[PDB]
Coordinates of C-alpha atoms in Angstrom, one line a residue:
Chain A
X1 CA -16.8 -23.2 9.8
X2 CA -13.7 -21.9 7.7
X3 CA -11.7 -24.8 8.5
X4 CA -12.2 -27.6 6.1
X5 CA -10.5 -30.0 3.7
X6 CA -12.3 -29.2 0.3
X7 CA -12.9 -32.5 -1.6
X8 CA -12.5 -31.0 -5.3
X9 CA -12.9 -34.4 -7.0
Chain B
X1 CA 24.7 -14.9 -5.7
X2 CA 27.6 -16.9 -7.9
X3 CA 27.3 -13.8 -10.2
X4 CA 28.2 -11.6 -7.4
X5 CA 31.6 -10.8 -5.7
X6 CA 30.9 -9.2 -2.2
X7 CA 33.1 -6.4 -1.4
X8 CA 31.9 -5.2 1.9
X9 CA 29.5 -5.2 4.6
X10 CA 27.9 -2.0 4.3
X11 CA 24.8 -2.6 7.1
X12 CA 23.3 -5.1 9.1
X13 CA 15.6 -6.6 6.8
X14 CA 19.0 -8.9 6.5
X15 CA 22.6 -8.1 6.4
X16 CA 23.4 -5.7 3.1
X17 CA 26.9 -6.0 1.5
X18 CA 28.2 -3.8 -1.3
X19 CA 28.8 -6.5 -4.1
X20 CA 30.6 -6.2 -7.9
X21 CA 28.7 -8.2 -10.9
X22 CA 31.3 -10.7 -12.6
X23 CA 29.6 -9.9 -16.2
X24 CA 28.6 -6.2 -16.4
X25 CA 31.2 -4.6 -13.3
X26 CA 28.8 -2.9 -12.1
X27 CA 29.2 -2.1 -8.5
X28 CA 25.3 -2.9 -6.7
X29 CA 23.7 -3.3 -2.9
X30 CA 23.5 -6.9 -1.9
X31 CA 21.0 -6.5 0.9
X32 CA 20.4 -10.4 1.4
X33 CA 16.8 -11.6 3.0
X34 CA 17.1 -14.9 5.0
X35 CA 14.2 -17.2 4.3
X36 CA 13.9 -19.9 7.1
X37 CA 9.6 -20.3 10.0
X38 CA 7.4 -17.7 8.5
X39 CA 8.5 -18.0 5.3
X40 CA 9.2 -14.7 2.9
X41 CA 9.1 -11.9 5.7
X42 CA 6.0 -9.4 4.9
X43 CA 8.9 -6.3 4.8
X44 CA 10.7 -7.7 2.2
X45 CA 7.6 -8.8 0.2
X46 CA 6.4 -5.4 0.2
X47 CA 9.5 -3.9 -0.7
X48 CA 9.8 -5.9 -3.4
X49 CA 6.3 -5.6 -4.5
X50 CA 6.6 -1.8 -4.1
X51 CA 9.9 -0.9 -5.6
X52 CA 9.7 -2.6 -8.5
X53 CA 7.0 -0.8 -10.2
X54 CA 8.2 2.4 -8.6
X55 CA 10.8 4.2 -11.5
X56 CA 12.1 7.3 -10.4
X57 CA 15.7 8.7 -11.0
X58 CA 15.0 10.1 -7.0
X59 CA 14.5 6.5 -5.9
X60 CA 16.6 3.8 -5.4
X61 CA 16.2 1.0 -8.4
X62 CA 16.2 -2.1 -7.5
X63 CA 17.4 -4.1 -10.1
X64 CA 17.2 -7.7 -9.7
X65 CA 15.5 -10.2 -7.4
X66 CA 17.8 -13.2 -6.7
X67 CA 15.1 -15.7 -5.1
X68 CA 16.0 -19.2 -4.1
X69 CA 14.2 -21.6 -1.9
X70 CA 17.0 -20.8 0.9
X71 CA 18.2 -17.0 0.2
X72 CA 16.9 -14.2 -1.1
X73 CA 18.5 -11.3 -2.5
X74 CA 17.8 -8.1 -3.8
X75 CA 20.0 -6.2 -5.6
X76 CA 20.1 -2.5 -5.8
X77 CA 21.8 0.4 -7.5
X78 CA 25.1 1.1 -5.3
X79 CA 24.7 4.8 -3.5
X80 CA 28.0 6.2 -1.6
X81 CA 26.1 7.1 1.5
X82 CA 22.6 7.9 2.8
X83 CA 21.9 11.5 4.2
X84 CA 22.9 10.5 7.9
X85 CA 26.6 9.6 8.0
X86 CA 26.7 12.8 5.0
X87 CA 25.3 15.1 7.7
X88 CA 27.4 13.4 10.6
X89 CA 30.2 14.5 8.2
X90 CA 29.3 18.0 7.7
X91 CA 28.9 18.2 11.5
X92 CA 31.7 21.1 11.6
X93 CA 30.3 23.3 8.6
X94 CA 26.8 23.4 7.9
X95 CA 25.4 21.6 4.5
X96 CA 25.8 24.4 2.0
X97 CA 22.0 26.0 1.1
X98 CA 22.2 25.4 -2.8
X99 CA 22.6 21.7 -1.7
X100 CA 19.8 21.5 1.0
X101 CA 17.1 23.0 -1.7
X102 CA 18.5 20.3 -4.1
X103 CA 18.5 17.4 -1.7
X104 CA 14.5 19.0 -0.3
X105 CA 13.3 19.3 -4.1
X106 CA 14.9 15.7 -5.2
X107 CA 13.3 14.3 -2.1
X108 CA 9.9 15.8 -2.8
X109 CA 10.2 14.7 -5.9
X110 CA 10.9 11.3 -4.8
X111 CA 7.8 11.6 -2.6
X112 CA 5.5 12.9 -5.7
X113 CA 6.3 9.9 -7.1
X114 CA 5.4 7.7 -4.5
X115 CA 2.5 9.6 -3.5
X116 CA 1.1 9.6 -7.5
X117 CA 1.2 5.8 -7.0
X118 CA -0.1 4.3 -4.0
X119 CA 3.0 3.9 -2.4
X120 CA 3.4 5.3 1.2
X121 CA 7.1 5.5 2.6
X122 CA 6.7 6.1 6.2
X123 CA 9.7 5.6 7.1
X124 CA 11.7 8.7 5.5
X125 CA 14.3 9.4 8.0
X126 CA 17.7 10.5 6.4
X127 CA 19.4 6.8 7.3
X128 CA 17.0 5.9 4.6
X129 CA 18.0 8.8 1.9
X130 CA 20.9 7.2 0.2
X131 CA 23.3 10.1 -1.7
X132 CA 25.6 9.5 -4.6
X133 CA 28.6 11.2 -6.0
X134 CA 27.1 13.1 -8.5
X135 CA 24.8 15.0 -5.9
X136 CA 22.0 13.2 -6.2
X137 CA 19.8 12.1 -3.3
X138 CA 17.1 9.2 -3.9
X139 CA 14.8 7.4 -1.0
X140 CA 15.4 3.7 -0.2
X141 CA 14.5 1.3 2.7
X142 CA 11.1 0.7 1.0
X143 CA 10.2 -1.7 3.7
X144 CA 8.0 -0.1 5.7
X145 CA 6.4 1.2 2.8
X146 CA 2.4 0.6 2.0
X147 CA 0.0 0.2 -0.8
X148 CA -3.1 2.4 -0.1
X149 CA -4.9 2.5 -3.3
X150 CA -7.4 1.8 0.3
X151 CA -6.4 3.4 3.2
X152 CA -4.0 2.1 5.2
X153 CA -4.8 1.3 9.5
X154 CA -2.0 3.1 11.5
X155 CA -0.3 0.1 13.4
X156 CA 11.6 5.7 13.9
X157 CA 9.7 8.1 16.5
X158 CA 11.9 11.4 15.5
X159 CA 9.8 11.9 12.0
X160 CA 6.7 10.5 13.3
X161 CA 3.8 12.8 12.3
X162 CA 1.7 14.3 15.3
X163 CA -1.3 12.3 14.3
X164 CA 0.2 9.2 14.4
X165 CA 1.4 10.6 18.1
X166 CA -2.3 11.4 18.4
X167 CA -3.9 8.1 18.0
X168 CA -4.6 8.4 13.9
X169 CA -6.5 5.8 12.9
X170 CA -5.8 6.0 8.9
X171 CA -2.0 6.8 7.8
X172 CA -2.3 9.5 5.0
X173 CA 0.6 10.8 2.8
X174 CA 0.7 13.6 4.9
X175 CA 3.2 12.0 7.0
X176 CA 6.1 11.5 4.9
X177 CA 5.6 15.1 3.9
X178 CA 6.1 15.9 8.0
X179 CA 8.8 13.3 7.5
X180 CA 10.7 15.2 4.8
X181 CA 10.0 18.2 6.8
X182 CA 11.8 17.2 9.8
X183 CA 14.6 16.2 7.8
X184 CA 14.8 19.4 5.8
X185 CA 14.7 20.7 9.4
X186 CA 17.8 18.6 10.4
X187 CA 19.3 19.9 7.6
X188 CA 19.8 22.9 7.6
X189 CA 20.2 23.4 11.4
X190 CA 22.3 20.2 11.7
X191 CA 19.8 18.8 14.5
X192 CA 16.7 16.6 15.5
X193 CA 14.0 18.7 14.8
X194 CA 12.2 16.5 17.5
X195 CA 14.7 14.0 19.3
X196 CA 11.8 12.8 21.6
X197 CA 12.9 10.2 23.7
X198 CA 9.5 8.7 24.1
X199 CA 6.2 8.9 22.3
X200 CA 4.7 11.3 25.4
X201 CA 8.2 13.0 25.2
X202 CA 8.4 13.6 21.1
X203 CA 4.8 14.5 21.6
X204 CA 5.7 17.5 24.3
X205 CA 9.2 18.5 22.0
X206 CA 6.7 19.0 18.7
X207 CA 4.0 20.9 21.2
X208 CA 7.3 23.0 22.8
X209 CA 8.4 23.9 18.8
X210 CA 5.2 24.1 17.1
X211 CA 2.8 25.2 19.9
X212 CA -0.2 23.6 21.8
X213 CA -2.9 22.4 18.5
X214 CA -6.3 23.9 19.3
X215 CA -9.0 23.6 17.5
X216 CA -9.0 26.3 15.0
X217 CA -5.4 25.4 13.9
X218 CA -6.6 21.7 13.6
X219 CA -10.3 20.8 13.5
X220 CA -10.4 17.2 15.8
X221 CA -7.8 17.4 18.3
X222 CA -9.8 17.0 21.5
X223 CA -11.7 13.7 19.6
X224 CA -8.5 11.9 18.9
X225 CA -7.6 8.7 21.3
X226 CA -4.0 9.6 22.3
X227 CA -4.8 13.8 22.9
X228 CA -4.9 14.3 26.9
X229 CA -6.8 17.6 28.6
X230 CA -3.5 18.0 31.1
X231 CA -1.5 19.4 27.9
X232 CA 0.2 21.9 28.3
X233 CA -0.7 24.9 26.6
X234 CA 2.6 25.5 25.1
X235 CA 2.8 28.9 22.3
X236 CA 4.0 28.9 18.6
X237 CA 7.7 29.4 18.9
X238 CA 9.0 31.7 15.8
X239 CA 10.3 30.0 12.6
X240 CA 13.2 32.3 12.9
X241 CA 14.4 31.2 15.6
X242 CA 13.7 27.1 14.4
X243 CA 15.6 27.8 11.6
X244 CA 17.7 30.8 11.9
X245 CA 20.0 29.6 8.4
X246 CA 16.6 29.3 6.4
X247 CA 15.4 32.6 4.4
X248 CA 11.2 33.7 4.0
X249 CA 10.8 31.6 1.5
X250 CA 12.4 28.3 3.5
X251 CA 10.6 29.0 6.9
X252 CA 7.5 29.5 4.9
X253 CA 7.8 25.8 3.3
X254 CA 8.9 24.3 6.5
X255 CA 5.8 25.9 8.2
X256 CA 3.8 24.3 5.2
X257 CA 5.3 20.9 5.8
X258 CA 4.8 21.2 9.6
X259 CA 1.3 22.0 9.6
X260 CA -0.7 20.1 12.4
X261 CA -3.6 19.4 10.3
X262 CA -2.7 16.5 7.6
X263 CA -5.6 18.1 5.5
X264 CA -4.3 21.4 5.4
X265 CA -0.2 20.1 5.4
X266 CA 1.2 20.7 2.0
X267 CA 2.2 17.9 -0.5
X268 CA 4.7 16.7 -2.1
X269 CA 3.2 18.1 -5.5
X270 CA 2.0 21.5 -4.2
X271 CA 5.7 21.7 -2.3
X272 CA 7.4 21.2 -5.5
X273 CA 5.9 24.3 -7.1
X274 CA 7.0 26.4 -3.9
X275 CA 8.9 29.9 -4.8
X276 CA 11.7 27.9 -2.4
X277 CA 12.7 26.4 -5.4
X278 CA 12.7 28.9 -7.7
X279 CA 16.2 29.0 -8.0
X280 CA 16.9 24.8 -7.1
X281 CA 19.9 23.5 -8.4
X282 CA 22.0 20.3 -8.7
X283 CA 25.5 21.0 -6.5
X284 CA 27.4 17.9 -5.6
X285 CA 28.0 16.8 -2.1
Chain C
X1 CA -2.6 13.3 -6.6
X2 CA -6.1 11.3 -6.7
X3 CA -6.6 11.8 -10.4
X4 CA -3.0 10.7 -10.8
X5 CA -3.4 7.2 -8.7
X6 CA -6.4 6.4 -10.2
X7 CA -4.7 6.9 -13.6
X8 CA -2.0 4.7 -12.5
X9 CA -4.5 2.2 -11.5
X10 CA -6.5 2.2 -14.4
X11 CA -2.6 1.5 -16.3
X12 CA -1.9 -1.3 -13.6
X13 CA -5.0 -3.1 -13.7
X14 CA -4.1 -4.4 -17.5
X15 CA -0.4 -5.5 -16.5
X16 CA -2.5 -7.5 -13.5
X17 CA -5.3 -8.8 -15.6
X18 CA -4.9 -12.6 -15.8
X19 CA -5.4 -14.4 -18.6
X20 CA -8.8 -14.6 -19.9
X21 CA -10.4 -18.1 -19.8
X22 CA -7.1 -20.1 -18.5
X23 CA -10.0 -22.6 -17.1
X24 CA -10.3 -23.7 -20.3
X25 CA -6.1 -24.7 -20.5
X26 CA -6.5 -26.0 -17.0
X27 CA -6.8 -30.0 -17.8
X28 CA -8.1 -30.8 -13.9
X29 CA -9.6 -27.6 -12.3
X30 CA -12.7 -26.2 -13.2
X31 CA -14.3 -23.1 -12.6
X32 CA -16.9 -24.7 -10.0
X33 CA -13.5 -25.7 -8.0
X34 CA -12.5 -22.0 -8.6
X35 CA -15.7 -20.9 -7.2
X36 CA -15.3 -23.6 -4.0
X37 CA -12.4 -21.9 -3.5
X38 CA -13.3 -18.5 -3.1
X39 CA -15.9 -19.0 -0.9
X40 CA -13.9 -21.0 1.2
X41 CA -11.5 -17.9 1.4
X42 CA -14.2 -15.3 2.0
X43 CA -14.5 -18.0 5.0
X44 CA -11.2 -17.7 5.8
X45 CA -11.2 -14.3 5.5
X46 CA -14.0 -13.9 8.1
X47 CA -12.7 -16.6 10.7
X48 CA -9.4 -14.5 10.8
X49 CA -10.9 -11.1 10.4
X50 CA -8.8 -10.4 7.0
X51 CA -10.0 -7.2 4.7
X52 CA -12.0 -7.1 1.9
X53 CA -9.0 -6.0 0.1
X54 CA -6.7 -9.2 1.2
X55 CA -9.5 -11.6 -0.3
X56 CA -9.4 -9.7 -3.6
X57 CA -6.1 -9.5 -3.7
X58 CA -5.5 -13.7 -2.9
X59 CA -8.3 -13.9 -5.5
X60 CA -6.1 -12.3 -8.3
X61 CA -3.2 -14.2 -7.0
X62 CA -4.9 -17.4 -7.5
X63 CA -6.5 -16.2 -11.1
X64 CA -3.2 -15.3 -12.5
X65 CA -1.4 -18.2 -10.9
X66 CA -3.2 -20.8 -12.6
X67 CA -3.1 -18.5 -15.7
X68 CA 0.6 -19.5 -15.3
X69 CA 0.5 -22.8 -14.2
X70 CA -2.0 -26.0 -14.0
X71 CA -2.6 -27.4 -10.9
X72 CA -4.0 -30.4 -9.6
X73 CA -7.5 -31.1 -7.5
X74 CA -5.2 -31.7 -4.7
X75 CA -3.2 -28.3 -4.9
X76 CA -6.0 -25.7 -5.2
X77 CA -6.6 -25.3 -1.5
X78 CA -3.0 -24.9 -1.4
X79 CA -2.5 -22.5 -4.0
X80 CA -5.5 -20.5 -2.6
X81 CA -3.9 -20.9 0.9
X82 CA -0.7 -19.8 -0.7
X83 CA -2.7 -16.8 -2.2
X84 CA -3.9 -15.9 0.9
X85 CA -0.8 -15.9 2.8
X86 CA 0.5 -13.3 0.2
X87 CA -2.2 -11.5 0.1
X88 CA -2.3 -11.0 4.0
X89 CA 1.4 -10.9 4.2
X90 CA 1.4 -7.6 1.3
X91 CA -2.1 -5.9 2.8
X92 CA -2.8 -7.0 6.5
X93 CA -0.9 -5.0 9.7
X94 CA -0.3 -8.6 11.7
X95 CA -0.8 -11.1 9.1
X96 CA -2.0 -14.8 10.3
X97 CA 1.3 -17.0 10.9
X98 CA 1.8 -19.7 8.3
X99 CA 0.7 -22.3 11.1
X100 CA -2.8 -20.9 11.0
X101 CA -3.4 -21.3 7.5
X102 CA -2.1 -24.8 8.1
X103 CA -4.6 -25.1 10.3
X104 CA -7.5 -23.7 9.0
X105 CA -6.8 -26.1 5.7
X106 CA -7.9 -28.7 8.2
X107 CA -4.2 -29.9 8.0
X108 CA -4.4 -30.9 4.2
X109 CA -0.9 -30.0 3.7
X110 CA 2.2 -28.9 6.3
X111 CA 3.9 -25.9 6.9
X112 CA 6.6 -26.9 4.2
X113 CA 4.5 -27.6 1.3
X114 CA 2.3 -24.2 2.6
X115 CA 5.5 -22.0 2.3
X116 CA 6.8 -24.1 -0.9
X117 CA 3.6 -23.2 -2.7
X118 CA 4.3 -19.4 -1.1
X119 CA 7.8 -19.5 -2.9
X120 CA 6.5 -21.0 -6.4
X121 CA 3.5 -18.6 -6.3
X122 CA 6.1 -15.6 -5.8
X123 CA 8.1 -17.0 -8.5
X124 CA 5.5 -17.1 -10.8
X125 CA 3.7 -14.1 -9.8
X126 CA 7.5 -12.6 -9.9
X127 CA 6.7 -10.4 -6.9
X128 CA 3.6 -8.3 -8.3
X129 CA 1.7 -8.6 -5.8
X130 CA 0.9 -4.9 -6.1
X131 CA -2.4 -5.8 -8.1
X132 CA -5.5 -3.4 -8.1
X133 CA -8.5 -5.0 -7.3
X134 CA -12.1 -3.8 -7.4
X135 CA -12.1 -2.4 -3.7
X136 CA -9.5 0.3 -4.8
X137 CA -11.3 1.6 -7.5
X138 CA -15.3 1.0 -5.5
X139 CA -13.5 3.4 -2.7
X140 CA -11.9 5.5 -5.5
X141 CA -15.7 5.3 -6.8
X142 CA -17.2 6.3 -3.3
X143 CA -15.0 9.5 -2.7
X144 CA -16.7 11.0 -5.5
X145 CA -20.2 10.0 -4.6
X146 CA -22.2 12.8 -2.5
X147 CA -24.6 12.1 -0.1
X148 CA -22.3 9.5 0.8
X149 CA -24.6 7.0 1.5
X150 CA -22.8 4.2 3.5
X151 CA -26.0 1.7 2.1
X152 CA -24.5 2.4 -1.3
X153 CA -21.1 1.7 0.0
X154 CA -22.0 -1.6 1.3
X155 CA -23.8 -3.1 -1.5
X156 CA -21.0 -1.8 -3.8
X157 CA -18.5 -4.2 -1.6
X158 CA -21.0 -7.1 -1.7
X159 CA -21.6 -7.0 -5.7
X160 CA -17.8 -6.3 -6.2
X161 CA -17.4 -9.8 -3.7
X162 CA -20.0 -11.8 -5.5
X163 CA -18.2 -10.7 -8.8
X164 CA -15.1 -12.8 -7.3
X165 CA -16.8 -16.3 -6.9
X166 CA -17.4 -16.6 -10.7
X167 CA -15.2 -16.4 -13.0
X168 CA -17.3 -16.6 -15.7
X169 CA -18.4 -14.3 -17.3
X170 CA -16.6 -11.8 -14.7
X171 CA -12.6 -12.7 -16.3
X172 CA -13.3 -10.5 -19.2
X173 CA -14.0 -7.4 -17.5
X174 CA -11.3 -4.9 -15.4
X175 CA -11.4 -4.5 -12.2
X176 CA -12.9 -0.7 -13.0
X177 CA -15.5 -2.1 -15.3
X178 CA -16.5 -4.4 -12.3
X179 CA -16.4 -1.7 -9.5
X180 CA -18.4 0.8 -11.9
X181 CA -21.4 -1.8 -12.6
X182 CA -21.3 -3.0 -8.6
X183 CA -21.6 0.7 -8.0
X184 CA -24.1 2.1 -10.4
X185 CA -26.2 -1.2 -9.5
X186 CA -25.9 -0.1 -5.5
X187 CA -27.1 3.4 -6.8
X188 CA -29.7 2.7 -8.4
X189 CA -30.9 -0.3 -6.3
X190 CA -31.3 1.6 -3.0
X191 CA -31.4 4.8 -3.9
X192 CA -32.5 4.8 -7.6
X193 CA -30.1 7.1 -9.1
X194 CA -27.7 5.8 -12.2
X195 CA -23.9 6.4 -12.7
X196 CA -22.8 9.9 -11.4
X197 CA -21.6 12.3 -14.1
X198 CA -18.3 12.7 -12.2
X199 CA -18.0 9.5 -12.1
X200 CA -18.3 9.9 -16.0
X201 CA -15.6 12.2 -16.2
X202 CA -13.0 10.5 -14.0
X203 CA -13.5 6.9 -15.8
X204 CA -14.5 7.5 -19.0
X205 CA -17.2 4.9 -18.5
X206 CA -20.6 6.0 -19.7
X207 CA -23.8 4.2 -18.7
X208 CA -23.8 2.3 -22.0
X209 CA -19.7 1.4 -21.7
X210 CA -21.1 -1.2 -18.8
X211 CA -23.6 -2.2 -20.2
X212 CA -22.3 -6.2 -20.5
X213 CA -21.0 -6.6 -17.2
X214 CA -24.3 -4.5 -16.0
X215 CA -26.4 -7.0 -17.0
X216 CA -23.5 -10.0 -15.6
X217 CA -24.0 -8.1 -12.4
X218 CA -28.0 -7.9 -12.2
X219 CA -27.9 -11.5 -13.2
X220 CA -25.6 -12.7 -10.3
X221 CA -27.4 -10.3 -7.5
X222 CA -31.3 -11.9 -9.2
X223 CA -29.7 -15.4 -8.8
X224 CA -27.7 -14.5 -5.7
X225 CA -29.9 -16.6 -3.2
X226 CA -29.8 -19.6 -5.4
X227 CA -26.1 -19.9 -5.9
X228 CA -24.0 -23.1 -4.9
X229 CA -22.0 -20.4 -3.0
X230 CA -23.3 -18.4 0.0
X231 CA -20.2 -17.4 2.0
X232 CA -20.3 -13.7 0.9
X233 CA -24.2 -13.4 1.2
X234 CA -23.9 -14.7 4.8
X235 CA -20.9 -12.3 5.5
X236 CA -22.6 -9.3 4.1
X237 CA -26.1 -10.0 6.4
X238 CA -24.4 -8.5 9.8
X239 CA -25.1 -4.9 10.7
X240 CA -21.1 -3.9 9.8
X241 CA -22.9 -4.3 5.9
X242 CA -25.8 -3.0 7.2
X243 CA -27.5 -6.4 5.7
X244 CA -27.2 -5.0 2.2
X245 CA -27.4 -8.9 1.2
X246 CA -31.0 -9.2 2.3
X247 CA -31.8 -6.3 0.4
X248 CA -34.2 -7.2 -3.0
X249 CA -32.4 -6.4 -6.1
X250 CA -34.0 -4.3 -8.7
X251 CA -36.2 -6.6 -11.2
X252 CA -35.2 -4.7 -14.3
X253 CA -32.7 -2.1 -15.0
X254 CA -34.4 1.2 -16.6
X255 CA -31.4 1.7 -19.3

């Protein structure tokens, strides 16, 4: 869904 | 803040104090934002956002932005008095005419402004028509105000448009220009135009003054969410005796202003070429 | 007054236009994280029901504000949160409280460093939040379009949308360059017909004046199915976009 930590790295 | 020396509470958006700069001596509006659990209120983002790329000499400047992590201040140009406590004043004698055709055309130009940007007042009332010494009336209390470069969903009640009575689901710029029409209205007969004390109520007063809308005189009446079959079917009253002070050329522009239909209502552009001001000067107050 | 707003947009859109390749000056972010992030605020944008407008709006937030400042891999969510925030707290009628947004970052950061990333972005941005985006000038674009085809309309917003995920090569171009490709693309892809004439005469653009980001634009709705990010095509399938993102795009473009 829309709620998510995005991992960048 | 430190650069500032309060002088008075002038209101109570935050509490506004009339303050005096240290450096320059100028004498500016202090209206003071309190930032605390949903951070920087929406209102004063807007107005911010909105006033500072509007420069008009008919709209108040605001001229610095004093944000802190705690406080926030905005600082505008210092007006005597807005347009209410100026007509509470001239309660005894009427507003002399010269000066209601200056106030109406610095207003509409005010609103010509706003209205060639994408700026929507919607809240023109005259507590938010600030009035300085040197005759010269300018809109403030951008708060309220909206961006619709796309239109903008409908979400005091005197200078509420009919639409917006009538379940409008866009807002168009037609309603500050029934806005500045009611005012214009209070003006010059030195009373509500519509004092409705209720939305049903304001509603009935507008239907009472203007007449019943049909459908000729506004296509879409019947389809609107708010409009009600058991309406009374109330006739046009004459403009004469709305506005007995006002000449031809005055009831004609108030009609324009008051038209039902925010298609056909006039605007602020097209109301500043009116024969009405044809002879417009700059009086002080 | 339309010929005079659009005017003023056209003049606002430069003093709004962020800095063109500020990826390259960012020493930790790159535009694949950019990208990540927009999709995850068209997400956003559709759990909480936000406008088209808000998303391009937090979108230009977020493009200037790293223009102005680098930030971290840790502090792009939040800046985009930030963004957001703005953006719905400027555009939306009942913007989301700053406890959703908290929330729907799956609790990466608190309410405090959500509305201390709110204050520095205002600060940076200095309170022009005001920017014109390519929705204003696609409706501008669609009041001057006759049948109004609402097919047209809704491609016009999904090309404009897809135009937000990359930031190459889609930095370089104004908002009204953008909205007048996404546009003439819609046009011609379900109806066949090129950029209006009135069109030409409000914008100045001529059919060859978009030429570059017309063939940017054909390029990202051919490769559209294939990209890393699929939030917008997803969001454009329901019957509100009448499914315009199922819809085949053109294979060449007859200029």
């Amino acid at each position: 869904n829309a709620r998510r930590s995005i991992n960048f790295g | 803040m430190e650069n500032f020396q309060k002088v008075e509470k002038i209101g109570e958006y935050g509490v506004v104090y009339k303050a005096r700069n240290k450096l320059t001596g100028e004498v500016v509006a202090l209206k003071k934002i309190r930032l605390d659990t949903e951070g920087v209120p929406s209102t004063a983002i807007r107005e911010i956002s909105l006033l500072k790329e509007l420069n008009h000499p008919n709209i108040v400047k605001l001229l610095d932005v004093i944000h802190t992590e705690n406080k926030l201040y905005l600082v505008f140009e210092f007006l005597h008095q807005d347009l209410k406590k100026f007509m509470d004043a001239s309660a005894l004698t009427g507003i002399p005419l010269p000066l209601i055709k200056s106030y109406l055309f610095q207003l509409l130009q005010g609103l010509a402004f706003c209205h060639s940007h994408r700026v929507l007042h919607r809240d023109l009332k005259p507590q938010n028509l600030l009035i300085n010494t040197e005759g010269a009336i300018k809109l403030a209390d951008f708060g309220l105000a909206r961006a619709f470069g796309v239109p903008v969903r409908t979400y005091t009640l005197w200078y509420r448009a009919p639409e917006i009575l009538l379940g409008c689901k866009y807002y168009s710029t037609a309603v500050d220009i029934w806005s500045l029409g009611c005012i214009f209205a209070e003006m010059v007969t030195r009373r509500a135009l519509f004092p409705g004390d209720s939305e049903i109520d304001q509603l009935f007063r507008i239907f009472r003054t203007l007449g019943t809308p049909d459908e000729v005189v506004w296509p879409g009446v019947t389809s609107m969410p708010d409009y009600k079959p058991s309406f009374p079917k109330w006739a046009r009253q004459d403009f004469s005796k709305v506005v007995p002070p006002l000449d031809e050329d005055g009831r004609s522009l108030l009609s324009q202003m008051l038209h039902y239909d925010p298609n056909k209502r006039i605007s602020a552009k097209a109301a500043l070429a009116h024969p009405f001001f044809q002879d417009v000067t700059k009086p002080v107050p | 007054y339309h010929e005079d707003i659009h005017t003023y947009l056209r003049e606002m859109e430069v003093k709004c236009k962020p800095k063109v390749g500020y990826m390259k000056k960012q020493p930790d972010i790159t535009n694949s994280m950019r990208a990540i992030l927009v999709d995850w605020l068209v997400e956003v944008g559709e759990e909480y029901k936000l406008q088209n407008e808000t998303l391009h709006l937090a979108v230009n937030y977020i493009d200037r504000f790293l223009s102005s400042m680098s930030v971290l891999r840790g502090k792009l969510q939040l800046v985009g949160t930030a963004a957001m925030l703005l953006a719905s707290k400027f555009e939306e009628i009942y913007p989301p409280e700053v406890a959703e947004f908290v929330y729907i970052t799956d609790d990466t950061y608190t309410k405090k460093q959500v509305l201390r990333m709110e204050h520095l972005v205002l600060k940076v941005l200095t309170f022009d939040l005001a920017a014109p985006t390519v929705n204003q000038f696609l409706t501008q674009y669609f009041l001057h379009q006759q049948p109004a085809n609402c097919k047209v309309e809704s491609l016009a917003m999904f090309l404009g949308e897809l135009s937000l995920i990359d930031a190459d090569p889609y930095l370089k171009y104004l908002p009204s360059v953008i909205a007048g490709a996404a546009f003439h693309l819609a046009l011609y892809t379900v109806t066949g017909q090129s950029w209006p004439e009135s069109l030409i005469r409000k914008t100045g653009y001529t059919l060859e004046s978009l030429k570059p980001c017309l063939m940017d634009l054909h390029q990202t709705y051919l490769k559209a199915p294939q990209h890393a990010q699929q939030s917008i095509r997803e969001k454009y399938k329901n019957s509100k976009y009448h499914g315009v993102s199922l819809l085949n795009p053109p294979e060449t473009l007859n200029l």
